[PDB]
Design an enzyme around this catalytic site. Structure first.
Site, short mmCIF file in Angstrom:
data_model
loop_
_atom_site.label_atom_id
_atom_site.label_comp_id
_atom_site.label_asym_id
_atom_site.label_seq_id
_atom_site.Cartn_x
_atom_site.Cartn_y
_atom_site.Cartn_z
N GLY A 83 0.80 -1.23 0.00
CA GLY A 83 0.00 0.00 0.00
C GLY A 83 0.83 1.27 0.00
O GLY A 83 0.27 2.31 0.33
N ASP A 85 2.05 2.93 -2.56
CA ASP A 85 1.78 3.79 -3.73
C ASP A 85 1.61 5.22 -3.24
O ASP A 85 0.64 5.50 -2.50
CB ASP A 85 0.53 3.38 -4.48
CG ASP A 85 0.48 3.92 -5.89
OD1 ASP A 85 0.10 5.12 -6.05
OD2 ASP A 85 0.79 3.14 -6.81
N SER A 90 -3.30 1.79 -5.36
CA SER A 90 -3.57 0.40 -4.91
C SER A 90 -4.92 0.30 -4.18
O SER A 90 -5.39 -0.85 -4.03
CB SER A 90 -2.44 -0.12 -4.06
OG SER A 90 -2.08 0.83 -3.08
N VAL A 151 6.47 -6.04 -1.71
CA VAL A 151 7.33 -6.62 -2.77
C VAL A 151 6.62 -6.40 -4.10
O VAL A 151 7.32 -6.10 -5.11
CB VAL A 151 7.62 -8.11 -2.49
CG1 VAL A 151 8.00 -8.87 -3.74
CG2 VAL A 151 8.69 -8.23 -1.42
N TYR A 447 8.35 6.19 -7.99
CA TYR A 447 8.06 7.51 -7.41
C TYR A 447 6.85 8.09 -8.12
O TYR A 447 6.92 9.19 -8.66
CB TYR A 447 9.30 8.39 -7.50
CG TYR A 447 10.41 7.98 -6.58
CD1 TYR A 447 10.27 6.99 -5.62
CD2 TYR A 447 11.62 8.66 -6.64
CE1 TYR A 447 11.30 6.68 -4.75
CE2 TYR A 447 12.65 8.33 -5.80
CZ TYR A 447 12.49 7.34 -4.85
OH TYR A 447 13.51 7.08 -3.97
C1 LIG Z 1 9.80 4.14 1.33
C2 LIG Z 1 8.50 4.31 1.75
C3 LIG Z 1 8.19 4.66 3.19
C4 LIG Z 1 7.44 4.20 0.81
C5 LIG Z 1 5.99 4.30 1.25
C6 LIG Z 1 7.73 3.96 -0.51
C7 LIG Z 1 9.04 3.73 -0.94
C8 LIG Z 1 10.10 3.81 -0.01
N1 LIG Z 1 11.41 3.61 -0.37
C9 LIG Z 1 11.64 3.22 -1.62
C10 LIG Z 1 12.97 2.89 -2.04
O1 LIG Z 1 13.92 2.92 -1.28
N2 LIG Z 1 13.14 2.45 -3.34
C11 LIG Z 1 12.12 2.39 -4.23
O2 LIG Z 1 12.36 1.95 -5.39
N3 LIG Z 1 10.86 2.75 -3.87
C12 LIG Z 1 10.64 3.13 -2.64
N4 LIG Z 1 9.35 3.43 -2.26
C13 LIG Z 1 8.31 3.35 -3.29
C14 LIG Z 1 7.84 1.97 -3.50
O3 LIG Z 1 8.81 1.17 -4.18
C15 LIG Z 1 6.57 2.07 -4.34
O4 LIG Z 1 5.61 2.91 -3.72
C16 LIG Z 1 5.96 0.70 -4.51
O5 LIG Z 1 4.98 0.78 -5.52
C17 LIG Z 1 5.35 0.22 -3.22
O6 LIG Z 1 4.83 -1.10 -3.44
P1 LIG Z 1 3.68 -1.62 -2.45
O7 LIG Z 1 4.08 -1.29 -1.08
O8 LIG Z 1 3.46 -3.02 -2.95
O9 LIG Z 1 2.53 -0.58 -2.82
P2 LIG Z 1 1.07 -0.81 -3.34
O10 LIG Z 1 0.42 -1.96 -2.63
O11 LIG Z 1 0.44 0.56 -3.18
O12 LIG Z 1 1.25 -1.17 -4.88
C18 LIG Z 1 1.94 -0.22 -5.74
C19 LIG Z 1 1.51 -0.41 -7.18
O13 LIG Z 1 1.86 -1.75 -7.62
C20 LIG Z 1 0.71 -2.51 -7.87
N5 LIG Z 1 0.86 -3.81 -7.25
C21 LIG Z 1 0.98 -4.09 -5.92
N6 LIG Z 1 1.07 -5.36 -5.67
C22 LIG Z 1 0.97 -5.96 -6.91
C23 LIG Z 1 0.99 -7.29 -7.32
N7 LIG Z 1 1.07 -8.30 -6.47
N8 LIG Z 1 0.86 -7.55 -8.64
C24 LIG Z 1 0.78 -6.52 -9.48
N9 LIG Z 1 0.75 -5.22 -9.21
C25 LIG Z 1 0.86 -5.01 -7.90
C26 LIG Z 1 -0.46 -1.74 -7.24
O14 LIG Z 1 -1.66 -2.04 -7.91
C27 LIG Z 1 0.00 -0.30 -7.45
O15 LIG Z 1 -0.23 0.10 -8.79
#
Ligand SMILES: *c1c(C)c(C)cc2c1nc1c(=O)[nH]c(=O)nc-1n2C[C@H](O)[C@H](O)[C@H](O)COP(=O)(O)OP(=O)(O)OC[C@H]1O[C@@H](n2cnc3c(N)ncnc32)[C@H](O)[C@@H]1O
Ligand SMILES: CC(=O)N[C@@H]1[C@@H](O)[C@H](O)[C@@H](CO)O[C@H]1O
Ligand SMILES: [Cl-]
Ligand code: NA
Ligand code: NA
Length: 502
Positions: A83, A85, A90, A151, A447
């Protein structure tokens, strides 16, 4: 939506019942389940659009169900893992939508023999790091700093961290993956094909399917790593120091050395006045003696001394890099919830030439007058310069000195307050224009910035998607679009910044 809810139960495998995974607002659970993976308080306001349903997938079958049912019922699905994003894509949508929440699929199976690990997309970076460190203090994985990042989104979007100069991105270190496609087939690298396996390694997984797991390639980390944080104000010659950082951090410092530069506005030495603080935050894959020789030769202006160096495990470097105390227990990495939630805006840029000192003093005056925006400079070069732009959907390789993250956080709720901080963020980005890449202005997918454009996913989708897609993916945008048109011609997997069909 009861024909959809019925299709879901209808498709339930009896070995893993779907009912305990379905939350509607009539369950008193619903609010906290929606809220559990919210990482931007902007998207927790009463006025933020709520999904009508959340599936907390407990098995591959819950994903298959949700895809097949949502598809024949024409429903908007938002996939959520951690979460994080920055735009809440998401868990937020302006059409009726449900969230497929992946957090219960968080298996991390570390194999030190093959230096690999099967990581479910619901796992957090902290769980992955914790699980590597439990088997071996000399293996790691070159992902992001934030332990609670998921991930799914992190790898999907081309995640980077403080070892990218040595090992490249997360997406440069994947051997295999499991993905559920628009047809509900469970695929791995082999059945998925190299096109789809490429697309989900930086091209945004949510455009192509539900990624269930990545098989990640672990990397060797030394028995001892070095970290430091050194802070310089303009009054401590920060302009000269930043200027020198620009010439060495991507171009000259060995691939083992990552020096991030955080620029923020702090109280000056005279009362009421403000100054710019330049924070140099580093992971050196090696010991302080080799680091101090490098810094004395290539970057003596920082004045880095033995007393600045902390020597520790790679795993405790992670703690340090996320502001957790270096002697904290490692299982703090298993906390899925960050200690602080804020309202936040992020943007990104790429710098291809050093900013002249005149330009830095320019930026200091603009940053002092906008107070709240900070900038984080992440040096590229080393492995990031060696990998061709085509290797992953992520194109930002050679020619990029560093990636800027624009970081604006606040605590005040409401759009009025939001508009103010968004405006400050947009102004600093505006000021940075001449210094950063142009034609086009490069952006980093992870980002995520909806200011780059919104895909409404109608007639105009390809046209609207070009506005962010070329910025995120440069010349790889065309390959993503070709693959999207083949694997999801009906655009079931869509979002406000999804890859469009031709
Ligand atoms: C530090 C912090 C505190 C945050 C909140 C974000 C960070 C971060 N540090 C980062 C860093 O050091 N290096 C990075 O490359 N990015 C960093 N980020 C950003 C982070 O990588 C992105 O925000 C990433 O998208 C987060 O992923 P998440 O936690 O899985 O987030 P979401 O659940 O909101 O999903 C994001 C995006 O991807 C799609 N998604 C999620 N899970 C999916 C699966 N299983 N299959 C396909 N698509 C998937 C979501 O729908 C959404 O579009
Ligand atoms: C994580 C977070 O801050 N969530 C808040 C919650 O604390 C608050 O009580 C609720 C109204 O009951 O509205 C949510 O957005
Ligand atoms: Cl962040
Ligand atoms: Na709610
Ligand atoms: Na050197």
């Amino acid at each position: 939506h009861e024909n959809f809810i019925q299709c879901l139960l209808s498709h339930s495998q009896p070995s893993h019942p779907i009912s305990p995974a379905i939350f509607t607002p009539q369950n008193s659970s619903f609010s906290s389940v929606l809220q559990a993976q919210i990482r931007n308080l902007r998207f927790n306001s009463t006025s933020t659009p709520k999904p009508f349903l959340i599936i907390t997938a407990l098995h591959e079958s819950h994903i298959q169900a949700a895809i097949i049912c949502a598809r024949k019922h024409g429903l908007q699905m938002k996939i959520r893992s951690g979460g994080h994003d920055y735009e809440g894509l998401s868990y937020v949508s302006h059409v009726p939508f449900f969230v497929l929440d992946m957090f219960n699929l968080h298996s991390v199976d570390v194999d030190i023999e093959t230096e690999t690990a099967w990581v479910q997309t619901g796992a957090t970076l902290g769980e992955v790091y914790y699980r590597i460190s439990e088997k071996s203090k000399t293996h790691g994985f070159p992902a992001g700093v934030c332990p609670t990042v998921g991930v799914g989104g992190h790898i999907g979007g081309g995640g980077y961290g403080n070892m990218m100069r040595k090992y490249g991105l997360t997406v440069d270190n994947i051997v295999d993956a499991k993905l559920v496609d628009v047809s509900g087939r469970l695929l791995d690298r082999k059945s998925m094909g190299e096109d789809l396996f490429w697309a989900i390694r930086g091209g945004g997984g949510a455009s192509f399917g539900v990624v269930l797991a990545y098989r990640i390639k672990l990397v060797r980390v030394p028995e001892t790593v070095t970290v430091f944080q050194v802070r310089k104000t303009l009054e401590q010659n920060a302009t000269e120091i930043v200027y020198r950082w620009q010439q060495v951090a991507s171009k000259q410092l060995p691939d083992d050395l990552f020096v991030r530069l955080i620029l923020d506005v702090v109280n000056g030495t005279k009362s009421g006045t403000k100054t710019v603080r330049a924070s140099f935050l580093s992971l050196f894959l090696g010991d302080s003696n080799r680091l101090l020789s490098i810094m004395n030769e290539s970057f003596p202006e920082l004045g880095l001394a033995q007393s600045d160096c902390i020597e520790t495990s790679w795993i405790r470097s992670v703690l340090f890099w996320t502001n957790f105390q270096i002697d904290d227990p490692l299982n703090i990495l298993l906390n899925r919830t960050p200690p602080t939630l804020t309202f936040l805006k992020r943007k990104s840029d790429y710098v291809k030439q050093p900013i002249p000192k005149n330009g830095l003093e320019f930026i200091w005056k603009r940053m002092i007058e906008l107070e709240t925006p900070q900038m984080i400079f992440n040096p590229y070069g080393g492995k990031m310069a060696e990998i061709p732009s085509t290797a992953t959907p992520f194109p930002h390789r050679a020619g990029n000195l560093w990636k800027i993250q624009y970081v604006t956080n606040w605590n005040e709720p409401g759009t009025d307050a939001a508009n103010r901080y968004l405006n400050l963020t947009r102004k600093l980005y505006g000021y940075m224009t001449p210094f950063v890449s142009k034609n086009p202005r490069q952006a980093f997918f992870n980002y995520r910035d909806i200011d780059l454009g919104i895909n409404h996913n109608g007639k105009a989708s390809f046209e609207e998607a070009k506005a962010y897609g070329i910025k995120y993916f440069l010349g790889n945008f065309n390959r993503l679009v070709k693959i999207k048109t083949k694997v999801d011609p009906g655009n079931f997997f869509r979002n406000e910044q999804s890859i469009p069909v031709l």
